[PDB]
């Protein structure tokens, strides 16, 4: 294979995305399964190591040896509160190797431990291979993104993951900066610009305030919720349906994992339908004890079941504005990042808070960060 271009990689907590700027435009590259995002999942099995979609697709079969969320561990100490709080919700074990966390798995019949940058390097190797399979050329150069709140250790651990993956990490840039680059907010005529990046995707909520002057990105403040996303919105619809099934059939389906899974899968799809329609219908035959569950939900009901969670997103916005020492009227641009920002109610809350101000949302929210990293990659190629 000949030498190819530089790529932009968004290394996410649950999903990653790779982009390439070619022929005057950014192209988000689809993986071997045709997916524009790849799960940040690594599976260890008796016979093999699986990455991305292949790892996620066998998580229900092998929960303990399927690693995800390495981004929540990367560059952190074992005793970090985030590490200590997070390991109660992971099915894989996290061990202490002289102050550093390691994920302990069973691989080819043997007990093996891996550092978070080693797990992230396998994910980065996957993104590199996805780019190479599409371009039909070798991919060595990359711009890799990181959250703005990341510390020196976390940034270095991400660069090391790039190095272990055989990548030449040209530049590590902040995710809100990449999002701002995607919309070309640094190229706008006038004085310094205050940009709010509203990032609701991959199980995390991040708000960042940036000031862009003469191309100098400055991160004034960061706020958010470490755990908040689509999975929570899904659960609320699941609770609603379980209660409905109890009222209609006087039966509790909550203890049947398969019934709850069928329902949860249908709810996540209904939630997506509710982003462009005001109603979604669900038909599940023989959901529980031979009972067919045929129902529907309005966008209004979905919004009420999630009112506290949707409204709760403005607290971080208020906190970031107070830390940046800015009034809401001083924000020149608002950018939507992450798949859950496609929810009309979230968009409505944020536009109303910002007094009818138009949101930058034309680029797919899930792809905006990789898109900005790909533009940057082309400028450095």
């Amino acid at each position: 294979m000949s030498k190819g271009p530089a790529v932009g990689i968004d290394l996410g907590t649950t999903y990653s995305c790779v982009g390439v700027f070619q022929h005057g435009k950014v192209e988000i590259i689809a993986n071997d399964q045709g997916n524009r995002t790849t799960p940040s999942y690594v599976a260890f099995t008796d016979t093999e190591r699986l990455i991305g979609d292949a790892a996620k697709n066998q998580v229900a079969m092998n929960p303990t040896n399927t690693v995800f969320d390495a981004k929540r561990l990367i560059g952190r100490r074992f005793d970090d509160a985030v590490v200590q709080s997070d390991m109660k919700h992971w099915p894989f074990m996290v061990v202490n190797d002289a102050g550093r966390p390691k994920v302990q798995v069973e691989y080819k019949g043997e007990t093996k431990s891996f550092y978070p940058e080693e797990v992230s390097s396998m994910v980065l190797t996957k993104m590199k291979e996805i780019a190479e399979a599409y371009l039909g050329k070798t991919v060595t150069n990359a711009v890799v993104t990181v959250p703005a709140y990341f510390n020196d250790s976390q940034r270095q651990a991400t660069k090391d993951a790039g190095t272990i993956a055989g990548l030449n990490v040209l530049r590590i840039i902040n995710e809100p900066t990449a999002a701002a680059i995607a919309y070309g907010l640094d190229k706008k005529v006038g004085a310094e610009r205050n940009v709010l990046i509203f990032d609701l995707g991959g199980g995390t909520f991040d708000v960042s305030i940036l000031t862009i002057e003469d191309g100098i990105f400055e991160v004034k403040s960061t706020a958010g919720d470490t755990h908040l996303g689509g999975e929570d919105f899904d659960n609320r619809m699941v609770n609603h349906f379980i209660a409905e099934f109890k009222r209609k059939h006087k039966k509790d389906i909550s203890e049947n994992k398969r019934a709850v899974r069928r329902l949860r899968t249908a709810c996540e799809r209904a939630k997506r339908t509710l982003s462009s329609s005001t109603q979604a219908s669900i038909e599940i035959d023989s959901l529980y004890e031979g009972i067919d569950f045929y129902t529907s939900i309005t966008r209004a009901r979905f919004e009420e079941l999630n009112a506290d969670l949707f409204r709760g997103t403005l607290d971080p916005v208020e906190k970031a504005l107070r830390d940046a020492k800015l009034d809401k009227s001083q924000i020149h641009d608002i950018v939507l990042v992450g798949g859950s920002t496609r929810i009309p109610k979230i968009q409505k809350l944020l536009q109303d808070f910002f007094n009818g101000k138009e949101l930058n949302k034309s680029i797919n929210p899930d792809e905006a960060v990789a898109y900005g990293a790909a533009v940057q990659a082309a400028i450095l190629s």
Partner: protein, 115 residues
């Protein structure tokens, strides 16, 4: 609605269900093979330690089979069939029940080995 009102639109839904029926038959064949392999381990000369390993490799394959049947149910669950699509509705119900009868068979295997 009306009788003898078979529509071209319903042919599309029936085609989706027939592909799913075919996928269920292949998964079912894998279940039967696992069943023969189970009897094979039970009626063979594997000592206790190697028998435990063979039953655990079999357990992972039974969990894979269960997952495939669960993915079929989730695919069938994406279907919205109008009440007038009587044939599709009957076929969807029969396929779901057949998959659930196969799942109950997987569970007799899975719960009885490598606990």
């Amino acid at each position: 609605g009306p009788l003898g009102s078979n529509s071209p639109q319903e042919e599309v839904e029936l085609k989706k269900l027939k592909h799913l029926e075919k996928s269920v038959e292949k998964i079912a064949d894998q279940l039967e093979e696992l069943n023969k392999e189970l009897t094979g381990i039970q009626q063979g000369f594997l000592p206790k330690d190697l028998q435990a390993e063979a039953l655990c490799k079999l357990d992972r394959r039974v969990k894979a089979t269960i997952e495939q049947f669960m993915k079929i149910l989730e695919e069938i669950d994406t279907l919205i069939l109008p009440e007038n699509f009587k044939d599709s509705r009957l076929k969807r119900k029969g396929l779901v029940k057949k998959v659930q009868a196969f799942l109950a068979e997987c569970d007799t295997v899975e719960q009885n080995i490598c606990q």
